[PDB]
Design a protein around this ligand. Structure first.
Ligand code: HEM
Ligand code: UB7
Ligand code: CL
Length: 393
């Protein structure tokens, strides 16, 4: 019925070049079984989209990683939104959607845009820079911790903590275990900044605590919802912006089109999110014996969704290996789909738009002038270092 495959989607050889193995996963069938970790896998757009939009059958409360929370204890207290199902997910999701609302983006857009223009001006004075550390990392670190309301001290724990959370979604390989074996300092800092006295007024974290009045969340729920923003609102955006600059460096014809019409900046970032898919994979757990694409999946089984493979499926996308800033990206699952679709997608799109807008208006060429190093993560796909030479427009 179901083809069995020995491909390890969490090995270094897979992270280094996943596209050939992702076609093998798609072409093998709509549902595969991965003997390496005893999990079901779906790599086509159709099945990935169906699993995401059936939260009842493919639950999230038993973990969005490999580990089954009904069988093992989670390395940290479960997230009140990511690792919950309706109706327990509904009200905490509604609060976060109002904290990161369209009305919230209006209060932060000008400061986010100004900091984006100032960063590109600073990098043009240096010429040859690292598009990861000096751009993909430096810019979100310059706007997001302030928008969260975090103090200055201890911000060096934010990125290590985020990479740990995303590595912990994977199997118990060395990547996950070495991350957990280094987690105590990063866990202590993040848990402390989630408390109301440590969140500056007006920030995202303080806004969450102010939503305990309405009966949607209780005061004891607010710290964990702040923890979700510190776990998902930084490193995701870093690799998304790093992906956008990477594509603009690998597709100069698309950079020139972006320069001619900087209003394409928002879609240029969205296409980058589809092209690279910073969030490559995560899991669901069947609550019931379900038939998916002609295959019977039993109860309590982990289902691995390949978001990046779904975003490159030729059954859904015309020329999926092509970076096209004018492509109608509507329907891609880079931000997920359904009740769990990324609640911070407006913040990420704002950061990506104003950074690509600043590059469109100020930069004439982006040329790689050094060794490209890939950052390895069980869930995240991104670059460790991207040496580029920026030519002023
Ligand atoms: C390029 C940037 C980003 C990408 C690619 C991304 C990707 C995703 C994806 C695919 C999901 C679905 C998870 C699932 O279905 O299990 C998700 C959920 C989530 N994201 Fe993002 N995200 C990004 C930025 C952000 C930002 C900026 C924030 C907060 C400021 C954030 C916070 C969250 C939260 C809290 C959830 C859980 C929502 C829920 O379970 O209902 N993410 N993200
Ligand atoms: O990057 C992600 O997919 C993600 C990680 C953590 C959380 C959370 O802490 O609720 C939500 C989303
Ligand atoms: Cl924690």
């Amino acid at each position: 019925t179901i083809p069995h495959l020995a491909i390890d989607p969490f090995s270094l050889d897979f992270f280094d070049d996943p596209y050939p193995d992702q076609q093998t996963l798609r072409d093998a069938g709509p549902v595969v079984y991965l003997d390496k970790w005893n999990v079901y896998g779906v790599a086509r757009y159709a099945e990935v989209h169906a699993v995401l939009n059936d939260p009842t059958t493919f639950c999230s409360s038993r973990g969005v990683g490999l580990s089954d929370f009904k069988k093992e204890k989670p390395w940290r207290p479960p997230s009140l939104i990511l690792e919950a199902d309706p109706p327990a997910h509904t009200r905490p999701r509604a609060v976060l959607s109002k904290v990161l609302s369209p009305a919230t983006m209006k209060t932060i857009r000008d400061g986010f845009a100004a900091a984006a223009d100032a960063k590109v001006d600073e990098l043009l004075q240096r010429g040859c820079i690292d598009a990861i550390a000096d751009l993909a990392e430096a810019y979100p670190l310059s706007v997001f911790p302030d928008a969260m309301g975090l103090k200055q001290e201890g911000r060096e724990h934010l990125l290590p903590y985020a990479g740990l959370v995303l590595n912990a979604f994977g199997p118990p390989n060395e990547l996950r275990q070495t991350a957990i074996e280094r987690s105590a300092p990063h866990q202590a800092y993040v848990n402390e900044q989630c408390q109301r006295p440590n969140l500056a007024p007006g920030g995202f974290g303080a806004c969450i605590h102010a939503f305990t009045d309405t009966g949607e969340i209780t005061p004891d729920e607010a710290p964990l919802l702040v923890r979700s923003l510190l776990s998902a609102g930084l490193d995701t955006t870093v690799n998304g912006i790093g992906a956008a600059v990477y594509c603009l460096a690998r597709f100069p014809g698309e950079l020139q089109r972006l320069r001619s019409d900087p209003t394409l900046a928002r879609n240029a970032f969205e296409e980058a999110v589809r092209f690279e898919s910073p969030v490559q994979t995560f899991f669901r757990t069947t609550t019931r014996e379900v038939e998916l694409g002609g295959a019977v999946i039993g109860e309590g089984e982990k289902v691995l969704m390949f978001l990046g493979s779904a975003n490159r499926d030729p059954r859904r996308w015309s020329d999926p290996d092509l970076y096209d800033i004018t492509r109608k990206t509507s329907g891609h699952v880079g931000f997920g789909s359904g009740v769990h679709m990324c609640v911070g997608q407006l913040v990420a799109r704002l950061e990506g738009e104003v950074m690509l807008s600043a590059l469109a208006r100020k930069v004439a060429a982006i040329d790689i002038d050094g060794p490209v190093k890939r950052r390895f993560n069980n869930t995240l796909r991104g670059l460790e270092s991207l040496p580029v030479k920026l030519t002023p427009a």
